[PDB]
Amino acid sequence: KPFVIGIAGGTASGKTTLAQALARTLGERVALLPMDHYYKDLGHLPLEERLRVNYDHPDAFDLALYLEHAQALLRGLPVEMPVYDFRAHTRSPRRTPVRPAPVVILEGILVLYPKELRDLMDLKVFVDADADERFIRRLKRDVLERGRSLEGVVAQYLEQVKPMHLHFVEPTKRYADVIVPRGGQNPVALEMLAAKALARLARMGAA
């Protein structure tokens, strides 16, 4: 049985980085599935309509698919992970191979919302950061990498990302076993999580 780690947290909280650093520390032994790339394929709709969608509401996510893949890896099967194109606002034509592994990291802003996802997790983590600090990174990433305007980001954040976060994301902190501050730069928490996983991996091999 693969050690399942659930990593949730607000947008730009450091959960992507934390997840990757943990993935990098265990090498070939981890499969990382970012739920933030599993938005429903709305490619058949005009840009005007893909731009109105609230991408922070659980309904914007293809939970069916995400869970299908989470369960495939749990049975030692690989998946063709979809890739969301954040610049064009649609499911990209690009796919990415994710091989099964003894450690599966389920990372995303809402990976702790559906009970179906929680039941698959051995360790549930919430990466904590104050919205002001997170907004700074959100804005930077959006203007530098996603073709987003200054006004567009503020608008999106205030009428969507934020209220959705307070109402959906943030409450899932109650389901967390451990809370990680400064997810992006916390070598101590990283080591402890690696150690936790290393111990479980040892239980897999040892008998």
Ligand X SMILES: Nc1ccn([C@@H]2O[C@H](CO)[C@@H](O)[C@H]2O)c(=O)n1
Binding residue positions for ATP: 9-16
| Positive or negative torsion for Cα 70, 90, 56, 34 | positive
Chosen from ligand X, its own copies, none, partner binding at 56 (C-beta under 5 to 8 Å by type):
ligand X
189 binds its own copies (CB under 8 A): yes
> Closest approach of Cβ 104 to its own copies, in Å?
16
User: What SS3 class is residue 95?
Assistant: strand
> Closest approach of Cβ 111 to its own copies, in Å?
16
Structure tokens, 201:
């991996």
64 binds its own copies (CB under 8 A): no
Among residues 196, 205, 206, 207, the one that binds its own copies under rule CB under 8 A: 196
| Positive or negative torsion for Cα 111, 113, 118, 120 | negative
Chosen from ligand X, its own copies, none, partner binding at 86 (C-beta under 5 to 8 Å by type):
ligand X
> Closest approach of Cβ 189 to its own copies, in Å?
5
> Closest approach of Cβ 56 to ligand X, in Å?
5
Cβ pair 186, 18 in contact under 8 A: yes
Residue type, 46: P
Cβ pair 156, 104 in contact under 8 A: no
The whole-angstrom separation of Cα 7 and Cα 176 is 9
**Which residues from 168-187 bind its own copies, rule CB under 8 A?**
173-174, 176-181, 186
> Closest approach of Cβ 2 to its own copies, in Å?
16
29 binds its own copies (CB under 8 A): no
CB of 85 or CB of 122, closer to ligand X: 85
| Positive or negative torsion for Cα 121, 58, 61, 154 | negative
7 binds its own copies (CB under 8 A): no
# residues near its own copies by CB under 8 A: 22
The whole-angstrom separation of Cα 26 and Cα 135 is 30
